[PDB]
Amino acid sequence: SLVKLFTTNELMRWPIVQKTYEPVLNEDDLAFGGEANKHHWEDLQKRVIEHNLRVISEYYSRITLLRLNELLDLTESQTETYISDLVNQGIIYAKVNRPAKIVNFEKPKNSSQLLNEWSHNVDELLEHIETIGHLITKEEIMH
Amino acid sequence: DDLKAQFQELDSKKQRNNGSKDHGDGILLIDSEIARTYLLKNDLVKARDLLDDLEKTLDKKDSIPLRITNSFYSTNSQYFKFKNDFNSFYYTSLLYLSTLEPSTSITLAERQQLAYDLSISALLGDKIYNFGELLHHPIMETIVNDSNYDWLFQLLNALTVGDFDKFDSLIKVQISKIPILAQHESFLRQKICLMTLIETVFVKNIRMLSFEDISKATHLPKDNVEHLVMRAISLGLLKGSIDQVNELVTISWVQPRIISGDQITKMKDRLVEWNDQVEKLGKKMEARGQSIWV
Amino acid sequence: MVLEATVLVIDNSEYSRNGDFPRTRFEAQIDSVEFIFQAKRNSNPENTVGLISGAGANPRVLSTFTAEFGKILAGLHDTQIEGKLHMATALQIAQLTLKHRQNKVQHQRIVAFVCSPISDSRDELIRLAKTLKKNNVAVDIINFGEIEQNTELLDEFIAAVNNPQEETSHLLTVTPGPRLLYENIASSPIILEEGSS
Amino acid sequence: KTAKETKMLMNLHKEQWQSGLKMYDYEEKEESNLAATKSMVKIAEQYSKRIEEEKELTEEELKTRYVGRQDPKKHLSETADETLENNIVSVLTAGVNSVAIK
Amino acid sequence: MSLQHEKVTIAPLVLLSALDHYERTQTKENKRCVGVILGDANSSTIRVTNSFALPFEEDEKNSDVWFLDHNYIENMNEMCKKINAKEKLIGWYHSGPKLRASDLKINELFKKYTQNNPLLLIVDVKQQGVGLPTDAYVAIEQVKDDGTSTEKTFLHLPCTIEAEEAEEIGVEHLLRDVRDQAAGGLSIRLTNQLKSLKGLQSKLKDVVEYLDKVINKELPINHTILGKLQDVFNLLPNLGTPDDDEIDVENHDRINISNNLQKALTVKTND
């Protein structure tokens, strides 16, 4: 039930996931466990939000900054620290606006991308028409 | 176990008398039934590794009779509903139907009980939007006047049109009655909403939809709308991106569905137009710089 | 009989795993495929036999006309005991195998075993009956399957088809009960037949 | 020979219909154009050397005495034509696709 | 048996030969010939080295009825290996003109001999098209759910060719032509381009009339095909997009380079 959560892309907010698996997994030892062990447990938080952000870059191309804070359940100052940390690490591409406009995750849209995608598309078309053609031959025999 | 030993011995002589006959068939059937014993006595652990091994040897075969693979799927089907896994059963049930023996030894009772489990799986399901297709097959197709298969089939058809109102009435009564539905409430509740979303999206082939279209059709608040848009995208039913700043969903891909008759004509109309374009373009360009074409 | 190429049709229908001929009907037939090859050889050693199956949806050419005992035997080992008899396919294919031969001087004979009732369409049979006459082919039926309860569709046809000539097409009806099929074939004409000329 | 035999030998490319509408992925075209221009800058310097001379008595004597071979003239002419035709096909293909298909 | 069939290259001799065999048995008037195809395989690249005729009788009435002498194939073959171990029985050629479901019965018999899935080489002898009249098909057996349980089917694989050096000098020695399938110089490639357009136009026409027959002569609706046409329309380029602007800019660079190359050449001629 723990692994299968984090693999699916349906985001999930920290306060609750905490709760949920606390009386279950904190019982067991290594990583989680007793008193010393709690200063390793902590990291799980950090994991949750860099998974959420990661999902959001893919689906949201445009999102307002105030909204992104609401989702992450964090004050404005922490949210912005973390976005910065993710781009350094290269996990996501980000453009932030501090007067509280927009944070855009969209791909920087270059010349190359438009053309190369178009190039591909066209071969795929040609490939389709051919395939259709083999199968009309077949249907004569059937019929 | 007495029959299992019996057959192994017999085949040794008998292979040579026939001079050719695959007798490894009998064995597989015996093996299949033993796993079935175990499920009835609720020893899911023993039965499991015996299903595993069966699937591997069978599929290494390049040729298989219907009987053998049918028996093996039966064993699986039973295991999945006992466990109360809706997702798995739906996968099995389909297969079982495809490979289904032309034998009419298969009782009406057996058919009726399976028909029932398949419809309950598909409420609860993870990817079924193929409800109409399912109904078109003998297993459900004939068994409609019966009371168990009334309100049941009514639900499937409520999903197709995405009516929210008919849905609500059925579900309130029936959520008590069938206890599977009680524990799987989240799924079922999401399911009507989703099926409406796929319907709205397919008809409007334009590349953008406001949030306002979704809000009204599914009658939900806007908070819930963008999450519902996340779900479709996770299923792979849909692909695209979400603009929160303008409150848009830009759909960039539609997933093929059942091609109705009207659509056969539609395809044809565009293809003629695109015939002509190639045709016009080649003829003029031959004429231009006619002189050189070595 | 003299210098003869033979297509033998060995049939292994669902009725051939029976046991009318003790111990097992299949094993009584195995011996008969072997014996037919030998009888024909003993007649005139320049005779040849090739082999096709009645078993399955369709025939399979196991062996063409040959003098090697070995080819008939490997072919014989190949069977399916849930095969099924279709009279018409077997006839047609046999005529084709006859068109090509090691020595084309050799006469044209079909020997076919019948080990199940025959219910093929009549229309098919009528037309085949007179095809055979074009290309001048004779046929001997070792019959023991059909008679058990079903009237003979082939007899009349063969009879009409035959001319004064050394070749003589025949309907041979052999007692179907326990007596051993092979033993009875040796004790009835099959190479003790007389010419019609 | 027969003209049935001849025709069979002659056709040797079933992927003709595809390949001429096929255009090369575009990252490779940009790369190439820069290479070609820039490379010709260097063979132009060598061109300049060549025509410092062009004075020795007898064209052939120039080629032996000061090793006139390693001829810049020939490399610039070759290169220019090679790049030229490539660009003719490129502009044609892309432009044809765009209108035919849409 | 093997998946190793991912390209088929065919010697110019194979194509040539099959065509000759068709008239040296005198099978005509819509009568098939089947012959054995000998050569290398057991590899991604199939290299059909040679071919030989097989006695064949075709009967139009029943397509359940056919003659192929089994024992002949096998004798003839084994002598061929001693000359060259390169040749193995790798399948059989079919004279076309079209794929059949009656090709499948023939297929099963040859599959006993083979250690790979037989290659089914359709050399069409009506010699149609500007491309080769040769389609390549390998019998795949795949588990598929569409009401059917397991399908066996013939899947297109592309056609290409390859030629040995000696054989290649021989081909040019016959031709007085300098060839135009070459994709050679600037002249030739413009020619081929015009051929490529005329080619496309025909294929699309054939699609149009298939749809017609389904809505007027009631061929049963085959869903699979329409599914694909649906995508063809979904991934269609569109005008008014800033995509178009980019291509236009790109075009500007390419004229800039042509302009400079042409001027360089004005110098060269002046010189």
mmCIF file of N, CA and C in Angstrom, chain A residues 48-113:
data_model
loop_
_atom_site.group_PDB
_atom_site.id
_atom_site.type_symbol
_atom_site.label_atom_id
_atom_site.label_comp_id
_atom_site.label_asym_id
_atom_site.label_seq_id
_atom_site.Cartn_x
_atom_site.Cartn_y
_atom_site.Cartn_z
ATOM 1 N N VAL A 48 7.678 14.059 -0.495
ATOM 2 C CA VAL A 48 6.297 14.215 -0.842
ATOM 3 C C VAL A 48 6.086 15.452 -1.691
ATOM 4 N N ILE A 49 6.719 16.577 -1.372
ATOM 5 C CA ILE A 49 6.451 17.749 -2.076
ATOM 6 C C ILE A 49 7.181 17.861 -3.438
ATOM 7 N N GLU A 50 8.445 17.317 -3.483
ATOM 8 C CA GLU A 50 9.174 17.182 -4.780
ATOM 9 C C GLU A 50 8.653 16.094 -5.706
ATOM 10 N N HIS A 51 7.831 15.223 -5.111
ATOM 11 C CA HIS A 51 6.958 14.432 -6.010
ATOM 12 C C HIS A 51 5.744 15.183 -6.557
ATOM 13 N N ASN A 52 5.012 15.966 -5.707
ATOM 14 C CA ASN A 52 3.900 16.822 -6.102
ATOM 15 C C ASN A 52 4.166 17.915 -7.164
ATOM 16 N N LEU A 53 5.338 18.553 -6.964
ATOM 17 C CA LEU A 53 5.855 19.569 -7.874
ATOM 18 C C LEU A 53 6.139 19.005 -9.207
ATOM 19 N N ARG A 54 6.646 17.725 -9.127
ATOM 20 C CA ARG A 54 7.100 17.050 -10.288
ATOM 21 C C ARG A 54 5.948 16.696 -11.222
ATOM 22 N N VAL A 55 4.810 16.292 -10.587
ATOM 23 C CA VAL A 55 3.566 15.943 -11.243
ATOM 24 C C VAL A 55 2.983 17.157 -11.859
ATOM 25 N N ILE A 56 2.999 18.323 -11.186
ATOM 26 C CA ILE A 56 2.400 19.608 -11.484
ATOM 27 C C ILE A 56 3.099 20.178 -12.684
ATOM 28 N N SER A 57 4.460 19.998 -12.898
ATOM 29 C CA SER A 57 5.186 20.564 -14.056
ATOM 30 C C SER A 57 4.741 19.984 -15.305
ATOM 31 N N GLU A 58 4.419 18.622 -15.239
ATOM 32 C CA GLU A 58 3.919 17.887 -16.350
ATOM 33 C C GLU A 58 2.554 18.320 -16.741
ATOM 34 N N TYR A 59 1.616 18.540 -15.732
ATOM 35 C CA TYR A 59 0.215 18.646 -16.109
ATOM 36 C C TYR A 59 -0.129 20.112 -16.282
ATOM 37 N N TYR A 60 0.205 20.913 -15.291
ATOM 38 C CA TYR A 60 0.154 22.309 -15.373
ATOM 39 C C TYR A 60 1.261 22.862 -16.150
ATOM 40 N N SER A 61 0.973 23.509 -17.282
ATOM 41 C CA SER A 61 1.894 24.247 -17.979
ATOM 42 C C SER A 61 1.990 25.658 -17.438
ATOM 43 N N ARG A 62 0.799 26.188 -16.975
ATOM 44 C CA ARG A 62 0.654 27.518 -16.348
ATOM 45 C C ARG A 62 -0.054 27.373 -15.104
ATOM 46 N N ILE A 63 0.430 27.997 -13.980
ATOM 47 C CA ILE A 63 -0.385 27.924 -12.760
ATOM 48 C C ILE A 63 -0.031 29.200 -12.001
ATOM 49 N N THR A 64 -0.991 29.730 -11.263
ATOM 50 C CA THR A 64 -0.672 30.939 -10.475
ATOM 51 C C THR A 64 0.134 30.571 -9.268
ATOM 52 N N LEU A 65 0.968 31.493 -8.774
ATOM 53 C CA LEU A 65 1.836 31.191 -7.635
ATOM 54 C C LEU A 65 1.201 30.968 -6.307
ATOM 55 N N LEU A 66 0.115 31.708 -6.044
ATOM 56 C CA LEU A 66 -0.726 31.644 -4.820
ATOM 57 C C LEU A 66 -1.392 30.286 -4.730
ATOM 58 N N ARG A 67 -1.907 29.797 -5.907
ATOM 59 C CA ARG A 67 -2.467 28.457 -5.996
ATOM 60 C C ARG A 67 -1.448 27.311 -5.722
ATOM 61 N N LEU A 68 -0.253 27.409 -6.253
ATOM 62 C CA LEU A 68 0.745 26.437 -6.096
ATOM 63 C C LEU A 68 1.079 26.347 -4.601
ATOM 64 N N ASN A 69 1.020 27.462 -3.886
ATOM 65 C CA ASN A 69 1.313 27.451 -2.452
ATOM 66 C C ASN A 69 0.266 26.714 -1.714
ATOM 67 N N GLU A 70 -1.027 26.893 -2.085
ATOM 68 C CA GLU A 70 -2.123 26.262 -1.479
ATOM 69 C C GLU A 70 -2.073 24.757 -1.594
ATOM 70 N N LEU A 71 -1.671 24.262 -2.715
ATOM 71 C CA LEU A 71 -1.573 22.881 -2.983
ATOM 72 C C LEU A 71 -0.508 22.225 -2.165
ATOM 73 N N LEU A 72 0.659 22.961 -2.035
ATOM 74 C CA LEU A 72 1.817 22.429 -1.348
ATOM 75 C C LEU A 72 1.671 22.549 0.191
ATOM 76 N N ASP A 73 0.673 23.379 0.633
ATOM 77 C CA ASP A 73 0.423 23.535 2.084
ATOM 78 C C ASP A 73 1.628 24.145 2.714
ATOM 79 N N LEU A 74 2.097 25.230 2.008
ATOM 80 C CA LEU A 74 3.250 25.921 2.583
ATOM 81 C C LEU A 74 3.117 27.374 2.296
ATOM 82 N N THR A 75 3.602 28.199 3.272
ATOM 83 C CA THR A 75 3.703 29.661 3.243
ATOM 84 C C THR A 75 4.493 30.060 2.032
ATOM 85 N N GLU A 76 4.384 31.310 1.644
ATOM 86 C CA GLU A 76 5.007 31.778 0.417
ATOM 87 C C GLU A 76 6.469 31.633 0.376
ATOM 88 N N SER A 77 7.168 32.015 1.491
ATOM 89 C CA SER A 77 8.634 31.900 1.552
ATOM 90 C C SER A 77 9.236 30.521 1.441
ATOM 91 N N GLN A 78 8.798 29.469 2.084
ATOM 92 C CA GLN A 78 9.256 28.127 1.863
ATOM 93 C C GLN A 78 9.027 27.600 0.477
ATOM 94 N N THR A 79 7.862 27.832 -0.170
ATOM 95 C CA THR A 79 7.464 27.375 -1.491
ATOM 96 C C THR A 79 8.499 27.833 -2.465
ATOM 97 N N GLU A 80 8.820 29.150 -2.355
ATOM 98 C CA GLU A 80 9.752 29.678 -3.319
ATOM 99 C C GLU A 80 11.149 29.144 -3.164
ATOM 100 N N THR A 81 11.604 28.785 -1.919
ATOM 101 C CA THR A 81 12.902 28.221 -1.695
ATOM 102 C C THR A 81 13.018 26.913 -2.426
ATOM 103 N N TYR A 82 11.913 26.113 -2.390
ATOM 104 C CA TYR A 82 11.943 24.804 -2.819
ATOM 105 C C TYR A 82 11.941 24.755 -4.285
ATOM 106 N N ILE A 83 11.293 25.725 -4.938
ATOM 107 C CA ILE A 83 11.195 25.683 -6.426
ATOM 108 C C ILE A 83 12.609 25.887 -6.967
ATOM 109 N N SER A 84 13.364 26.738 -6.211
ATOM 110 C CA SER A 84 14.666 27.150 -6.599
ATOM 111 C C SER A 84 15.587 25.949 -6.558
ATOM 112 N N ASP A 85 15.528 25.153 -5.497
ATOM 113 C CA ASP A 85 16.238 23.962 -5.235
ATOM 114 C C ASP A 85 15.970 22.935 -6.257
ATOM 115 N N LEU A 86 14.731 22.740 -6.715
ATOM 116 C CA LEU A 86 14.459 21.794 -7.750
ATOM 117 C C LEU A 86 15.091 22.177 -9.049
ATOM 118 N N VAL A 87 15.152 23.446 -9.494
ATOM 119 C CA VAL A 87 15.720 23.775 -10.805
ATOM 120 C C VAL A 87 17.205 23.585 -10.832
ATOM 121 N N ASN A 88 17.861 23.806 -9.684
ATOM 122 C CA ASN A 88 19.316 23.620 -9.507
ATOM 123 C C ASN A 88 19.609 22.199 -9.702
ATOM 124 N N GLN A 89 18.764 21.373 -9.210
ATOM 125 C CA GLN A 89 18.920 19.909 -9.322
ATOM 126 C C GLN A 89 18.551 19.332 -10.617
ATOM 127 N N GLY A 90 17.809 20.139 -11.414
ATOM 128 C CA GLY A 90 17.516 19.905 -12.781
ATOM 129 C C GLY A 90 16.308 19.102 -12.991
ATOM 130 N N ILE A 91 15.510 18.864 -11.979
ATOM 131 C CA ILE A 91 14.381 17.982 -11.967
ATOM 132 C C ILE A 91 13.279 18.605 -12.821
ATOM 133 N N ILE A 92 13.178 19.942 -12.799
ATOM 134 C CA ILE A 92 12.081 20.651 -13.408
ATOM 135 C C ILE A 92 12.705 21.902 -14.016
ATOM 136 N N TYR A 93 11.899 22.531 -14.840
ATOM 137 C CA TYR A 93 12.239 23.717 -15.500
ATOM 138 C C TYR A 93 11.186 24.668 -14.925
ATOM 139 N N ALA A 94 11.598 25.922 -14.641
ATOM 140 C CA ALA A 94 10.728 26.760 -13.871
ATOM 141 C C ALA A 94 11.176 28.181 -14.252
ATOM 142 N N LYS A 95 10.138 29.033 -14.205
ATOM 143 C CA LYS A 95 10.191 30.417 -14.254
ATOM 144 C C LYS A 95 9.213 30.860 -13.276
ATOM 145 N N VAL A 96 9.685 31.674 -12.339
ATOM 146 C CA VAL A 96 8.923 32.155 -11.214
ATOM 147 C C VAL A 96 8.695 33.667 -11.409
ATOM 148 N N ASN A 97 7.526 34.246 -10.954
ATOM 149 C CA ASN A 97 7.426 35.646 -10.756
ATOM 150 C C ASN A 97 7.031 35.924 -9.317
ATOM 151 N N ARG A 98 7.938 36.658 -8.603
ATOM 152 C CA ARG A 98 7.722 37.181 -7.312
ATOM 153 C C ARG A 98 6.625 38.227 -7.206
ATOM 154 N N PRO A 99 6.251 39.199 -8.047
ATOM 155 C CA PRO A 99 5.050 40.046 -7.671
ATOM 156 C C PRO A 99 3.681 39.325 -7.650
ATOM 157 N N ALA A 100 3.735 37.989 -7.889
ATOM 158 C CA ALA A 100 2.789 37.061 -7.421
ATOM 159 C C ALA A 100 1.969 36.904 -8.597
ATOM 160 N N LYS A 101 2.652 36.798 -9.819
ATOM 161 C CA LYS A 101 1.895 36.665 -11.040
ATOM 162 C C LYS A 101 1.699 35.163 -11.380
ATOM 163 N N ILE A 102 2.722 34.576 -12.081
ATOM 164 C CA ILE A 102 2.611 33.293 -12.651
ATOM 165 C C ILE A 102 3.894 32.602 -12.454
ATOM 166 N N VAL A 103 3.795 31.273 -12.310
ATOM 167 C CA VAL A 103 4.902 30.390 -12.362
ATOM 168 C C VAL A 103 4.645 29.424 -13.464
ATOM 169 N N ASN A 104 5.493 29.385 -14.430
ATOM 170 C CA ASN A 104 5.317 28.703 -15.659
ATOM 171 C C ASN A 104 6.347 27.677 -15.685
ATOM 172 N N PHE A 105 5.827 26.475 -15.844
ATOM 173 C CA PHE A 105 6.626 25.317 -16.023
ATOM 174 C C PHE A 105 6.813 24.931 -17.485
ATOM 175 N N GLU A 106 6.103 25.592 -18.408
ATOM 176 C CA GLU A 106 6.062 25.192 -19.796
ATOM 177 C C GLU A 106 7.474 25.062 -20.398
ATOM 178 N N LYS A 107 7.628 24.153 -21.392
ATOM 179 C CA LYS A 107 8.935 24.010 -22.075
ATOM 180 C C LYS A 107 9.293 25.249 -22.730
ATOM 181 N N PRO A 108 10.544 25.779 -22.572
ATOM 182 C CA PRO A 108 10.943 26.921 -23.378
ATOM 183 C C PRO A 108 10.857 26.592 -24.814
ATOM 184 N N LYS A 109 10.013 27.325 -25.604
ATOM 185 C CA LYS A 109 9.613 26.806 -26.848
ATOM 186 C C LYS A 109 10.545 27.348 -27.895
ATOM 187 N N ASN A 110 11.464 26.414 -28.376
ATOM 188 C CA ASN A 110 12.524 26.791 -29.287
ATOM 189 C C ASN A 110 12.143 26.589 -30.728
ATOM 190 N N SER A 111 12.962 26.971 -31.709
ATOM 191 C CA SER A 111 12.741 26.748 -33.120
ATOM 192 C C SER A 111 12.742 25.326 -33.519
ATOM 193 N N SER A 112 13.791 24.666 -33.011
ATOM 194 C CA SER A 112 14.083 23.252 -33.242
ATOM 195 C C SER A 112 12.923 22.445 -32.889
ATOM 196 N N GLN A 113 12.282 22.625 -31.703
ATOM 197 C CA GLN A 113 11.239 21.750 -31.237
ATOM 198 C C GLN A 113 10.131 21.774 -32.262
#
